[PDB]
Subunit: 337 residues, 4 copies
């Protein structure tokens, strides 16, 4: 059997294959309340019918002002539990496992009113300057990630992923380019990592299941973070009990990034090798052959697929055919697959 | 531009492209009450996100004993209206038009208790002998199609299609192989067609929107119906106001059928030409090139896609690429399509 | 099995499949003597390795002033026999049958010195006015087609095709738009056809093997030839012993042509049905599904492939895969096909 | 521009792209004289028309008894120069560069009469036991590689590759599993490498152009050679002036090899990184995406394609389309590509 379609167990969770639907914002919560809509349901459940091993729900704000846009999904209120409970149940019924990405847009939040970050530094020339979070505010935000995780557990999610990438709040604390704080949350790598450290420990108090952390393995910028920095954070996350690091990159500030098939794979491979940590590979992986190569050559443990799953919801089937293998089809499509 | 992606107007309905999702039973009404389930919602709505011009909902029984299986959808009760109302609303929200196939399995019903047909002739050796419908029972069934159409209109459907194919009730009345009646519903081509004639006229009393009729253009059997017979029926349907004939074939009785890409297209083109009736082509059509060829060579007006839409929900996108053309993507997928 | 990959016998010739490499000028006779070059050898033989059932060599001029360009292949000299003999031998060694298209560009010849045609009417504004052939010149040309056919037979070709399409010499005689003669070669459909009639009869005197004739089934021009005219010609060719009509279209004069997948298939099916003549379909056919549909629906007997064989020399293999079937691979590629 | 289609200069040779047709035996020298045939010409030249940057001709024996089979190509005689001269000229004319793989089958030679190897050990239970080469015979074989290289230069080849892989002669000397010699050519890694060392130095005396060496980076067998051993040989080859190491693997003896897309890439990456030597990656690479990933992530310098070039001679075009880029088409196919 192909490794891509070989099961894997993480904590109490067993995925039927190594294909993961990468979290992707749909900006479709038109009521601006962070709640799910019929579109979200059809969008996610169709990939479950499509046999994706694990579906990670798009960035979901742990605080309303932590949304990227007012059309984002949210999990800052118990009122968000009802909808998510229906989603997890329906995705699970099709045979897929489901996760949610807990997030906070930080200085990249496109909302009216003050937005927050570790330091009052704008993302770019077009962005509003954020307010530096008070130590009190930082600690309250840590509690919001914990509270959000508790809601995700109640909602029935199998995995929880902390969004510590793409220039958002946590990433902003991690990088010296965006974190100029003079308190316990800034300075040394230990201090810059403190925010994430506290989030992981608190989430641990309410969630014992699989815990992923998505990082931007590089800032591709002089004086910014690079893979060496992230290998360091990874070892600390391993000690804290993080099960897998979802390896993305960039977006802290505009930068020149050479994009190509598997351009972020080196990050997943190095963290896996040097930090002895399971990793998720993502970034222009669009066919089963590359997915299989990545896994067989020990470059990552899970293959995150984003845009290809937008073009082909049934990528699992397509990948199976490309690898000349067979996978179970959803019962209702037996006469077509 | 490509004809396949050029709008077409039928009555007061305008389709953005000429791709139609052929009706396909999902056997997922697990409560056996003919109601829709979350699976049906994700199943159909995902193809609307996928830009299918017109989605025809699977065979929905106009009478509980007219279901193929107890897992079929139904529209024999006002209780079915609420669910269908949500479905049409959500499918239309994506930009697709939606239709429903009104059906009655006749002697091919796989249910407990008496099953009905024009004559007491079983489908095959493994099938129960059906009860010959009394003239009044035939009339009650006509009213049930009428009542079902009224519910469909209320639920918000854009198109209504009468299932007069695949060996089910109406087809059974149409063919001399299954209809041996000597009353007003049998004996001559006109009388064998009477049941359908009354159904069309009655549906017209409560529905003046697009009206489709799916037929099995041939029984592929000696003494059975052939394309010449259906060209005759098409002429009569034209006079009655039918807008398009969905051209399928077979299934009245077991027969040896040579299946291949476009094996039913000749039926669609002959009826279109000889009956001056718009037609829908269906059967082993799996790529944009053939779809465009059928439309451009005037063989049909709409291209019905079945199994390829089970393998690839976003066939519209794939076909556009194959035809070296571009179509609008759902807003949420602009970064991937 | 698939019809596309089922053998077919024409006269004493049996093709292993029904895929034909449509004649395509390579403009590679750099010494301007009409002789073959190493490029031509690799070009044609690679498609034989590729399992194409029948390979038709590009337009080969029966007279030097009948070439389209001075870079064309020729067969107006016994000096051309040696090269063609090597080509047929090597192509047949792979299992493919081979044919040659005998041609004469007429008024579309892009050469220095007088060019000829049935009437002194130029192709367009950027073309030289041709010399009206004297009756004797017409007769000499008929003999040149005969002599060319004799050379083709000697060189080992399996099939001979007369190029009576694309606005070249024979086509020019056939259409009233380009033929205004009032002698035995003009004035009525019979007289306009006379040139072709004499060519067929004379070729028959030295060649009794498969004989094809490529025509432009329509001029797409008011007062020009249309499919009705060609069905008439096909009936006459049938009487003369022509085995198959290769159905192309246009090019006599500039015209607006709606091109799409299978845009010339209607010509092939109408002639096949109304003239009871075997036909070759060509024009935007790029995949196995359409090829099979054309054959199974009785629209043509052979599928001519042009540009797709330039993009994919091994189209036979690709088509087999698309049709979920398998064909024998050349022995040398058994480990790859 | 994509790296796969970015030129690279090695010595005095510039390749227009990084795609290389991996050497592949055709067993088509039916006259058993090691000479080329029309099949070989069409086979190789078609990939040149297909735009492959570099075409490596199949294993060509430096001694008749060094052939794998009596149908192999040879270069053990000046009589082989004439044919090769025509091949290199024609491949170069299409715009591709060409190389030849100098080889000696050793104990895997399937010929009548004594076969040779470093030690009298059979390849497997089905094979004949080879005769241990005398020291004199070994040195004569070194001279045969030199003499063959001289013929390749005269024939017009751009690159010469030494076949030191797949269980053949040189590989047999390199591995302790097959080399039990007690003289200067056996024992220590220095002694086991001596045969290849002498071949490289002698070839250098007659050839100053690009020099490749293909190795089996692992024997996948206990007590056999592994990547660590080959990294060692690579450093020595670097010192000797070898320009690139073509990284294959296995075939010294039967072994359990886990085959998958890019399964030999780790070898190319490690040798490149640790030996500071340019490398060629090969082994189930069938699409442009993986080819691009390998190059962009610095895993190899050239992408060798084998079986995919047997299925798709115009893989370069296919890969270009997969990478959404454009490459020049052969002039004759401008209207198809
Ligand atoms: C429309 C869209 C929405 C996205 N939303 C998210 C998100 O909420 N969280 C996240 O971590 N990444 C997000 N991403 C990044 C993707 O998950 C993925 O890592 C990226 O596209 C690289 O992979 P791909 O080449 O497979 O698409 C998004 C990308 C797109 C195109
Ligand atoms: C699982 C399944 C369910 C189907 N259900 C229906 C149905 O409810 N009504 C109908 O008219 N045809 C039904 N069909 C026939 C299809 O609509 C379609 O006409 C047929 O599959 C031929 O087209 P295709 O080759 O595009 O699939 C079904 C076919 C399949 C495979
Ligand atoms: C480069 C090129 C050369 C051609 N040469 C010839 C020729 O010599 N004789 C002929 O009858 N048609 C010729 N044609 C027309 C083709 O044979 C074929 O009928 C046409 O391209 C339509 O088919 P296709 O879509 O499969 O390419 C040529 C077309 C191209 C693009
Ligand atoms: C029919 C055939 C012939 C081959 N001949 C040779 C050869 O002469 N020399 C060599 O080094 N490898 C030879 N190989 C191995 C290939 O060059 C290539 O390295 C191998 O197939 C792995 O790559 P692929 O997956 O791209 O085919 C051959 C393979 C096949 C299938
Ligand atoms: O909407 C795009 C998006 C990209 C990356 C993220 O992390 C979040 C949103
Ligand atoms: O489930 C298959 C099916 C086929 C044709 C129909 O019409 C109804 C159901
Ligand atoms: O080169 C294009 C060409 C087209 C049609 C012909 O018949 C001859 C040449
Ligand atoms: O013919 C297959 C073959 C494989 C590997 C080699 O090295 C030589 C020949």
């Amino acid at each position: 059997a192909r490794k891509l379609f070989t099961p894997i167990t993480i904590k109490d969770m067993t995925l039927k294959n190594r294909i993961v639907m990468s979290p992707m914002c749909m900006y479709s919560s038109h009521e601006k309340d962070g709640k799910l809509t019929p579109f979200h349901m059809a969008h996610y459940i169709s990939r479950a019918i499509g046999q994706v091993g694990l579906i990670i729900v798009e960035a979901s704000a742990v605080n309303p002002q932590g949304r990227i846009t007012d059309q984002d999904l949210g999990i800052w209120s118990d009122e968000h539990i009802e909808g998510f409970a229906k989603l997890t149940e329906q995705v699970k019924e099709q045979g897929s496992k489901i996760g949610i990405q807990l997030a906070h847009a930080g200085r990249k939040a496109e909302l009216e009113g003050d937005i927050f970050a570790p330091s009052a530094i704008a993302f770019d020339e077009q962005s509003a300057t954020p307010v530096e979070m008070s130590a009190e505010k930082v600690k309250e935000t840590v509690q919001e990630f914990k509270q959000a995780a508790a809601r995700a557990k109640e909602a029935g999610f199998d995995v929880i992923e902390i969004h510590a990438a793409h220039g958002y709040l946590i990433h902003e604390f991690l990088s010296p380019l965006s974190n100029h704080r003079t308190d316990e949350y800034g300075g040394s790598p230990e201090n810059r990592y403190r925010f994430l450290r506290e989030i992981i420990d608190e989430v641990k108090q309410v969630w014992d299941g699989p815990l992923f952390v998505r990082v931007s393995a590089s800032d591709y910028t002089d004086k910014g973070l690079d893979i060496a920095d992230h290998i360091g954070f990874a070892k600390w996350m391993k000690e804290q009990g993080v099960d897998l690091i979802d390896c993305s990159s960039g977006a802290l500030v505009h930068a020149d990034i050479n994009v190509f098939p598997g351009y972020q794979v080196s990050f997943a491979e190095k963290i896996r090798e040097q930090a002895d940590m399971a990793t998720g590979a993502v970034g222009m992986i669009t066919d089963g052959s590359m997915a299989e190569e990545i896994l067989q050559n020990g470059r990552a443990d899970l293959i995150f697929i984003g845009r290809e799953l937008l073009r082909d919801p049934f990528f699992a089937r397509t990948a199976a055919k490309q690898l000349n293998t067979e996978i179970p089809a959803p019962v209702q499509y037996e006469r077509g697959w």
